[PDB]
Structure formats: C-alpha cells, structure tokens
Amino acid sequence: TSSEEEDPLAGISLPEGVDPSFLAALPDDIRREVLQNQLGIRPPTRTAPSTNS
C-alpha cells in the first residue's frame, strides 16, 4: 500500500457505497475485486452491456 490515499471530497470517480478508505489503506487486489464484482462497472470503454456483474 501507499500513504497516497485518494479522498472522497477530491472529486474522485467512485460509485455510491464505495468509499476509498478501504481501497487505499488495503491493496489494489481487493480494491478492483470489490469494484468489478459488486457494481459491475468497468473503467475501460463499455462495448458490452452484459458485463461481469
């Protein structure tokens, strides 16, 4: 991990419910895990509505 934590008031692009404290304080592994699996949202370009969700 790093001390460089992303703050929610810093206008960072996260879905609702997803707070960056556990994302920045814990590794990037479970960070992408919780984003992709829970919300189904993809930061890369959406070309398929039937995504991993």
From Swiss-Prot:
Reported tissue expression: Weakly expressed in heart, brain and placenta but not in other tissues. Expressed in a number of cell lines, predominantly in those from colorectal carcinomas.
Subcellular location: Cytoplasm; Nucleus; Mitochondrion
PTM remark: Phosphorylated on tyrosine; phosphorylation is probably required for its ability to inhibit TP53 transactivation.
Membrane-spanning ranges: none
Known partners and oligomeric status: Interacts with isoform p14ARF of CDKN2A which strongly inhibits HUWE1 ubiquitin ligase activity. Interacts with MYCN, POLB and CDC6. Interacts with isoform 2 of PA2G4. Interacts with NR1D1. Interacts with AMBRA1. Interacts with HAPSTR1. Interacts with HAPSTR2. In hepatocytes, interacts with PAQR3; the interaction promotes PPARA poylubiquitination and STUB1-mediated degradation.
Associated pathology: Intellectual developmental disorder, X-linked, syndromic, Turner type: An X-linked neurodevelopmental disorder with highly variable clinical manifestations. Common features consist of moderate to profound intellectual disability, delayed or absent speech, short stature with small hands and feet, and non-specific but recurrent dysmorphic facial features such as macrocephaly, microcephaly, a broad nasal tip, deep set eyes, epicanthic folds, short palpebral fissures and a short philtrum. Patients may manifest other features, such as hypotonia, seizures and delayed bone age.
UniProt note: domains: The HECT domain mediates inhibition of the transcriptional activity of p53.
Family: Belongs to the UPL family. TOM1/PTR1 subfamily.
Function statement: E3 ubiquitin-protein ligase which mediates ubiquitination and subsequent proteasomal degradation of target proteins. Regulates apoptosis by catalyzing the polyubiquitination and degradation of MCL1. Mediates monoubiquitination of DNA polymerase beta (POLB) at 'Lys-41', 'Lys-61' and 'Lys-81', thereby playing a role in base-excision repair. Also ubiquitinates the p53/TP53 tumor suppressor and core histones including H1, H2A, H2B, H3 and H4. Ubiquitinates MFN2 to negatively regulate mitochondrial fusion in response to decreased stearoylation of TFRC.
Protein name: E3 ubiquitin-protein ligase HUWE1
Upper classification of the organism: Eukaryota, Metazoa, Chordata, Craniata, Vertebrata
Shown segment, full-protein numbering: 2951 to 3003 of 4374
